[PDB]
Amino acid sequence: DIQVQVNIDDNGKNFDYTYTVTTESELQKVLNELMDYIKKQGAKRVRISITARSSKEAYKFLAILAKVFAELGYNDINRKMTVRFRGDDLEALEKALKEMIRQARKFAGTVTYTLDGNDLEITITGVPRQVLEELAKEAERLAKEFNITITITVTVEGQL
């Protein structure tokens, strides 16, 4: 139902906790576990993605994420979202890519994208939470339009 990768790097200590929480009641638990950990041991660098399937879900998740890093006292924050489109007609896939990169760049946004046979990935950097959210509605209406599969991972790394 919902993917979670998490990375702590410390030089000498590293960790790649990787989850699938299905309820998302779960999700708060595991987020919570992690935090009690860093309050203790204290990490140098953390990164956390949470994968979604809906524009609405995307909203929840960076918010949830924001709360986390915020509680963590991590102000040197670094966002990112990687939209994933899936569909057989490679035409409409591209049509989406164009339109998607457009809007990402209508703001100060830097994209990378890869298309590897009917799977098109589009990463997106250098924007506020406010943009990402608005860029994800756009991701979702695009999916709906040409009836392609969408996914929206919401990364957010941060050091301190």
Author numbering: 3 to 162
Text lifted from the article:
Here, we explore the viability of such a mechanism by inserting one de novo designed alpha beta protein into another such that the two beta sheets are combined into one. The backbone geometry at the junctions between the original domains is regularized, and the sequence at the newly formed interface is optimized to stabilize the single integrated domain structure. Crystal structures of two such proteins demonstrate that complex beta sheet structures can be designed with considerable accuracy using this approach and provide a proof-of-concept for the hypothesis that complex beta topologies in natural proteins may have evolved from simpler beta sheet structures in a similar manner. Our success in designing larger beta sheet domains by recombining smaller independently folded beta sheet proteins suggests a similar mechanism could have played a role in the evolution of naturally occurring complex beta sheet proteins.
A first extended sheet protein was created by inserting a designed ferredoxin domain into a beta turn of the designed TOP7 protein to create a half-barrel structure, with the two sheets fused into a single seven strand sheet flanked by four helices. The CD spectra show both alpha and beta structures. The most similar SCOP domains had weak TM-align scores (0.54 and 0.51), and the sheets in these matched structures have different connectivities than those of the designs, suggesting that the two designed proteins have novel folds. The beta strand connectivity is quite different in the designs than in these closest structural matches.
